[PDB]
Write a structure and sequence with these properties.
This is part of a larger assembly, with chains A (about 290 residues), B (about 170 residues), C (about 160 residues) and D (about 130 residues). Chain B is α+β, with helices and mostly antiparallel strands and about 170 residues long. Chain B has 3 helices and 7 strands. Helices cover about 10% and strands about 20% of the residues of chain C. Classes of the chains: A alpha+beta (about 290), B alpha+beta (about 170), C mainly beta (about 160), D alpha+beta (about 130). Chain A binds 3 RNA strands through helix 1, helix 2, strand 2, strand 3 and helix 4. It is classed as ribosome.
Chain lengths: ~290, ~170, ~160, ~130
RNA sequence: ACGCAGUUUUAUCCGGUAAAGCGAAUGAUUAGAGGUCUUGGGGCCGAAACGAUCUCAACCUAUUCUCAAACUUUAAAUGGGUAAGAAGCCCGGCUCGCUGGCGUGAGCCGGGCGUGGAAUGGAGUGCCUAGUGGGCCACUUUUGGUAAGCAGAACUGG
RNA sequence: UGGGGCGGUACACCUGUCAAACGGUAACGCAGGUGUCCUAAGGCGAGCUCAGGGAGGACAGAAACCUCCCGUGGAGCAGA
RNA sequence: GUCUACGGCCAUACCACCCUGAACGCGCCCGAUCUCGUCUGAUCUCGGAAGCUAAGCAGGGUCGGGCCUGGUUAGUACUUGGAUGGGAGACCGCCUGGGAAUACCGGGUGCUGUAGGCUU
C-alpha cells in the first residue's frame, strides 16, 4: 500500500529528549547561560528569582543550583493575599506587585536586614535602583528567569519585578517593557505605570459597562459582587495591603494528621496473575469450538 | 451524552490563483476584500516553471482566512450556489472538505466593469474544543483517538445541519 | 606521506557515541575544579572551542591555573626518548575528575583512625597491603556420592 | 545439471549455489616497465573459508547415489580438495529431520513456500486465534 | 635513608583493530510465498477495462542464500597514561584594590602526629668533544606486483 | 626520477584509508581538493520548521497555489 | 496515597490502542475597554469564572513492538610467548596464559532532592 515509517528500525535508532523538554517545560539553551557560575568563585552561588503564571494563580520563588537539584530559600504565592485583605483579582498586574513585595520583605527578615533596605515606601512608578550602603552588609543581588514567556511590553512578570525592587532587592533592568513607554518616541511616562498597579484600568472597564449595559457586566464581574467590591476603593484597597505586607510578612504553616490511609489508585498486576489470564482465555476459545 | 464533543467550524480558507503578476492580481485582491471585510495577502512561487510561464519569487496568487460567525454566512452563500449537493469524494480522512466556484458573481455581488470575472476555492476545516493545545507553545500535546474526527462523522453533520445531499461515486 | 592537520585521524574519537548526541547534560559545568586536583582528559567534539590535541586524548594530568571557563593542566609527553612537561589550556566540557586516588584516600583516613583507636591495646596490627597468598590447606567432603566420570567424545562432521 | 537430468528427471530436484563473486582482480599488462603499477579490473572471483558450502542439492531419498555421482563429476572443475557429506537437516532448512515432521503437525512450523516459518509463544493472541481455527 | 627502574600487583581511565553482524542504519545481491499496491504490454481468453490472467524494469508485508580497506549496532587478547604518603594529615590565628546576603579563595605564621604493596641496585649534575649521517638479514604483521636471491614499511633480535 | 630523455609533480598545503585499537610510521601507493568567495554568508535578540509520503480542493494536467496528518534529521550550513 | 513550581540521572521513563480519575490542583473554557501583535484576538498579550472530564495530564492493561539485564551460543571464534612439530605449499595441530558477539530462551517497564498543598 504505502511504506510504513514507524517500524522496528525506527525505534532502534531513535533518541529521546530530556524529560522536561518532552513535557514542554524548560529551555536548556537559556538555562545554561543563567545558572552556571564562573569557575574562579567555586561555591559562590548565583541566585535567580523565578516567576511563573498559571490561569488562576502566580508563583514567585528564589533559588540556586547544585548537582542534586535547585535549592529553594524563599517562596510566595498569590493565593494568600486574603490574609492581607485582597479577596479577588488574583491574576492581574497588581497581584504581581504585591506578590513580589511580599517575597522581598520575607527574604530580608530571614537574613536579618529588614530594618534597612526599605525601597520606595511611597509608590510612584518611577525608576529606582537600590544602593548598597557602606558600613552595613551588602545588598542582595539576583537575576530574573522568565522562562518560555515572551517579554513583550506589559507582562505580569515585570509587574512582579518592580514589587521586589521597590521592596529592597538589587536587580538590573531597563524601562522598555514597563507600561508607560512610547515606541514612537522612546520615552517613559511613570504615571501610567502607576495606574496599572492600582487597578484603575479595571475600574474604567467596570464603570464603562455599568453605564452601557448590565447583563455583560454581571457576566464579566460576578465575583466582584460577592465580597461586594466596587470601582470606588481599588486604590485605597491595594494601598492598605502594601502597608500590611511591610508590617507582618512572616509566614506560618498548616499541620494536619492521622490520615485514614486509603488507596485511591490501582496497583500493578503481578506475574502469576498475568500468566493465569492467558490460560483461561485459551480455555474459553477452545471450549467455544466444542460448543459447535 | 456529548457536552463538549460538539462540532463547529474552526476556519474557512479562500484562495485564488491566476498565473500572472500584476493588474489581474490587484483586481482579484479587491474581490476578496469586499467579500470578507479584510485585506488578503499575496502569495509567491517556490521554484520556476517554463510551460506554465513563471519565475521564482514572483507573486502569483492571493488568499485569506476567516473565522467566527462570518464564516457561517459565507458558507451559507456558497452552498446556495451549490444547491446543497455534494459528493462523498470531496471529503477527506481528517474530517475536512471543500469545493470550488467557477464564477464569483452568483454570490449576490455586482459586476464592476473595471473588473472581469473570477473563480475561487473554498476549503472548510472542522474541529471541536480542546484542539488549541496542539499549537499551544506552553505545553503541547497530541489529542487522542476518541476525540479525532472521521470522514463519516462529517457526512452526518452536513446531512443534519442543512439537509444536504450526498451523491455516489 | 602524511599531512599535518590538527584533526587527522579523529573520525571516531571526536565523535559522539550512540544515541547520545544532543545538548550537554550540565552537571558537567557545575563541578568544582580547584588547584592541585588530578584530572583526565577526553575531547568532546560537540563543541569545538578549547579542545585539546589528539596527543592528550586519554592522558591524565594536574591543575595549575583556573579561568572563567577553562583550566590549565600539566601533562607529560614522550617524544623521542626524552619526556617533556606541558601546559595546555582546556575548557571544562572536555574533562572529568579521576577516581585514581580516592582509594588511597579511603585508606589513609581509615588507617589514621585504626591506628589512633585501638592504640591503647598495645599491638601493632597490620596496616599495609599484601599480595594474594597461597591457598590454605583444607578438607573436601564427598557427602555420599561418588564423583561423575568424564571421557572424550567421537568426532562428527557436523558441517 | 546435465547428469542429474539424464538420471532422475527434469523436475526431480532443486539445486542452489551458495557463493557469490564479489572480489575483484587486477592486471598489469606489460604490452616504462615497473613504473606506475596498479592494475585494471579484469576479473571477478569468490573467496572461500574452510567449512563453507559451495553447492547443494535437494531431492528425494531413492535418488541418493545419483546425487553423489553428480557432485563427484563437479570437483574436477575446481582447484583444490573438496569433500561431500549428507546433512541431517530437512532440505534447505535448519531443523533436524526427526523433529521436523512431528513439529509441523503441532503448529510451530508453517510451510510458507520453499521454506518454513517458525513461530514462538510470545506475540499477541489474535495470531493464536487465527491458527487453531 | 632517601631516590631510581623497556619489571609485576591492587585500584582507575583511553582506544574501535582482529572476530562477528545485516530478521539493526549506509551500500550491494539471490529465490520463492501472501500485494492486478501499481505504470504499460512481443501479448494474453475478448470491444477491452483494475472481467480475468500472467508477468516483467521496478515496486507493500513476513521470511530466505551471500558480501565490505575507504560500512557498522556490538566487541577482545597484547598495549598506553595516572596513583600507591613528610612536597602527607590535623589544630589555631593573621593579610588581601580579588569575589561578595553573611561568605569564598589564595598566601603567611605557630604547633601535634613517621615504616605506608612485591622483588632489584649507589644516585645526581655541568663543561669540552670525535667518527657517523650509502645499510643488510630472519620469525610474526604487511602494501604494489604473476613471481622474484624484486621494490617500500611496523616489532624485537642479529 | 625502478639507468637518463620525453611524460608527471610524489617540489608548500587539506580529508579519508593503508597504519598492525594511544600517538608516530614509507613507495611515480588508492580516491579527491587548493592559490578562492562574503557589507553579509560577520555579530546580538526574537519567532518558526527541513527532506519527503499520504488524502482532499474550479480550469489544474506527473509538476503552479490552498488546507490537514505522519515525519530523529533520511534536508540545509559557499567550495573536497 | 497523590498533585503543583524548580530540577538531577536522561526510553526500567519511548510508540500504538483500551479502562478508571474522591478532594486540592492543573487545564479546557468566556470576552477584547485599556497593554501588545496579528491578512484573521487562531497563536501571543490583557481582563475574567457560567459549565466540563470529552481531551491533555495521572495511574493501570496488552501470551504488545522497542529498551535494560541475565542465560545459551562457547571455553567456540580469535589471540601473547615457544619449538631442529607436521606438510610440496596453502595451512593444521600442540605447550604456556587470556577470552567475544548474533540467532534462540527468560525476567523488569522510572528512580529520586528542595519548597508547598489535599488526603480533617
Ligand atoms: Mg530567550
Ligand atoms: Mg582507523
Ligand atoms: Mg574482518
Ligand atoms: Mg655530532
Ligand atoms: Mg638527475
Ligand atoms: Mg597501531
Ligand atoms: Mg478565545
Ligand atoms: Mg481528562
Ligand atoms: Mg475519560
Ligand atoms: Mg515485550
Amino acid at each position: 500500500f504505502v511504506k510504513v515509517v514507524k517500524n522496528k528500525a525506527y525505534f532502534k535508532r531513535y533518541q529521546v529528549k530530556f524529560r522536561r523538554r518532552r513535557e514542554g517545560k524548560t529551555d536548556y539553551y537559556a538555562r545554561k547561560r543563567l545558572v552556571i557560575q564562573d569557575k574562579n568563585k567555586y561555591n559562590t552561588p548565583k541566585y535567580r528569582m523565578i516567576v511563573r503564571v498559571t490561569n488562576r494563580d502566580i508563583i514567585c520563588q528564589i533559588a540556586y543550583a547544585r548537582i542534586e537539584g535547585d535549592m529553594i530559600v524563599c517562596a510566595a504565592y498569590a493565593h494568600e493575599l486574603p490574609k492581607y485583605g485582597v479577596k479577588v483579582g488574583l491574576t492581574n498586574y497588581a497581584a504581581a506587585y504585591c506578590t513580589g513585595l511580599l517575597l522581598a520583605r520575607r527574604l530580608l527578615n530571614r537574613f536579618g536586614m529588614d530594618k534597612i533596605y526599605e525601597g520606595q515606601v511611597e509608590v510612584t512608578g518611577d525608576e529606582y535602583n537600590v544602593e548598597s550602603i557602606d558600613g552595613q552588609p551588602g545588598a542582595f543581588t539576583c537575576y530574573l528567569d522568565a522562562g518560555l514567556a515572551r517579554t513583550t511590553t506589559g507582562n505580569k512578570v515585570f509587574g512582579a519585578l518592580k514589587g521586589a525592587v521597590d521592596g529592597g532587592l538589587s536587580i538590573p533592568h531597563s524601562t522598555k517593557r514597563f507600561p508607560g513607554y512610547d515606541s514612537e518616541s522612546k520615552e517613559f511616562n511613570a504615571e501610567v505605570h502607576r495606574k496599572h498597579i492600582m487597578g484603575q484600568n479595571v475600574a474604567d472597564y467596570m464603570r464603562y459597562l455599568m453605564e452601557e449595559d448590565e447583563d455583560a457586566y454581571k457576566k464579566q464581574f460576578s465575583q466582584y459582587i460577592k465580597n461586594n467590591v466596587t470601582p470606588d476603593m481599588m486604590e485605597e484597597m491595594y494601598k492598605k495591603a502594601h502597608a500590611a505586607i511591610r508590617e507582618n510578612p512572616v509566614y506560618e504553616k498548616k499541620p494536619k494528621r492521622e490520615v485514614k490511609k486509603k488507596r485511591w489508585n490501582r496497583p500493578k498486576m503481578s506475574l502469576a496473575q498475568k500468566k493465569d489470564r492467558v490460560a483461561q482465555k485459551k480455555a474459553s476459545f477452545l471450549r467455544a469450538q466444542e460448543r459447535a | 451524552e456529548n457536552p463538549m464533543r460538539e462540532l463547529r467550524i474552526r476556519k474557512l480558507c479562500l484562495n485564488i490563483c491566476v498565473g500572472e503578476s500584476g493588474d489581474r492580481l490587484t483586481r482579484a485582491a479587491k474581490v476578496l476584500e469586499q467579500l470578507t471585510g479584510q485585506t488578503p495577502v499575496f502569495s509567491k512561487a517556490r521554484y520556476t516553471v517554463r510551460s506554465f510561464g513563471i519565475r521564482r519569487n514572483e507573486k502569483i496568487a492571493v488568499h485569506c482566512t476567516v473565522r467566527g460567525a462570518k464564516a457561517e454566512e459565507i458558507l451559507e452563500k456558497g452552498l446556495k450556489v451549490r444547491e446543497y449537493e455534494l459528493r462523498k469524494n470531496n471529503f477527506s480522512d481528517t474530517g475536512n472538505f471543500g469545493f470550488g466556484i467557477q464564477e464569483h458573481i452568483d454570490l449576490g455581488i455586482k459586476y464592476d466593469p473595471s473588473i472581469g470575472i473570477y473563480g475561487l476555492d473554498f476549503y472548510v476545516v472542522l474541529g471541536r474544543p480542546g484542539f488549541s493545545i496542539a499549537d499551544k507553545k506552553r505545553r503541547t500535546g497530541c489529542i487522542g483517538a476518541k476525540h479525532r474526527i472521521s470522514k463519516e462523522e462529517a457526512m452526518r453533520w452536513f446531512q443534519q445541519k442543512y439537509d444536504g445531499i450526498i451523491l455516489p461515486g | 606521506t602524511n599531512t599535518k592537520g590538527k584533526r587527522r585521524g579523529t573520525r571516531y574519537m571526536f565523535s559522539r557515541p550512540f544515541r547520545k548526541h544532543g545538548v550537554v547534560p550540565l552537571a558537567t559545568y557545575m563541578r568544582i575544579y580547584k588547584k592541585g586536583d588530578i584530572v583526565d582528559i577526553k575531547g568532546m567534539g560537540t563543541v569545538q572551542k578549547g579542545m585539546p590535541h589528539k596527543c592528550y586524548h586519554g592522558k591524565t594530568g594536574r591543575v595549575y591555573n583556573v579561568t572563567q571557563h577553562a583550566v590549565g593542566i600539566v601533562v607529560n609527553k614522550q617524544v623521542k626518548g626524552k619526556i617533556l612537561a606541558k601546559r595546555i589550556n582546556v575548557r571544562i566540557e572536555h574533562i572529568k575528575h579521576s577516581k585514581s586516588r580516592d582509594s588511597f584516600l579511603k585508606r589513609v583516613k581509615e588507617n589514621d583512625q585504626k591506628k589512633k583507636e585501638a592504640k591503647e591495646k598495645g599491638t601493632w596490627v597490620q596496616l599495609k597491603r599484601q599480595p594474594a597468598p597461597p591457598r590454605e590447606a583444607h578438607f573436601v567432603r564427598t557427602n555420599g556420592k561418588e564423583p561423575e566420570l568424564l571421557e572424550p567424545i567421537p568426532y562428527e562432521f557436523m558441517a | 545439471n546435465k547428469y542429474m537430468v539424464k538420471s532422475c528427471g527434469k523436475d526431480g530436484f532443486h539445486i542452489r549455489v551458495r557463493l557469490h563473486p564479489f572480489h575483484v582482480i587486477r592486471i598489469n599488462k606489460m604490452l616504462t616497465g615497473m613504473r606506475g603499477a596498479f592494475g585494471k579490473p579484469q576479473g571477478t572471483v569468490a573467496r572461500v573459508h574452510i567449512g563453507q558450502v559451495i553447492m547443494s542439492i535437494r531431492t528425494k531419498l531413492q535418488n541418493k547415489e545419483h546425487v553423489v555421482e553428480a557432485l563427484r563429476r563437479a570437483k574436477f572443475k575446481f582447484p583444490g580438495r573438496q569433500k561431500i557429506h549428507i546433512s541431517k537437516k530437512w532440505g534447505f532448512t535448519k531443523f533436524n529431520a526427526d523433529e521436523f515432521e512431528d513439529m509441523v503437525a503441532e503448529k510451530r512450523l508453517i510451510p510458507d513456500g520453499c521454506g518454513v516459518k517458525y513461530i514462538p509463544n510470545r506475540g499477541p493472541l489474535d495470531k493464536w486465534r487465527a491458527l487453531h481455527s
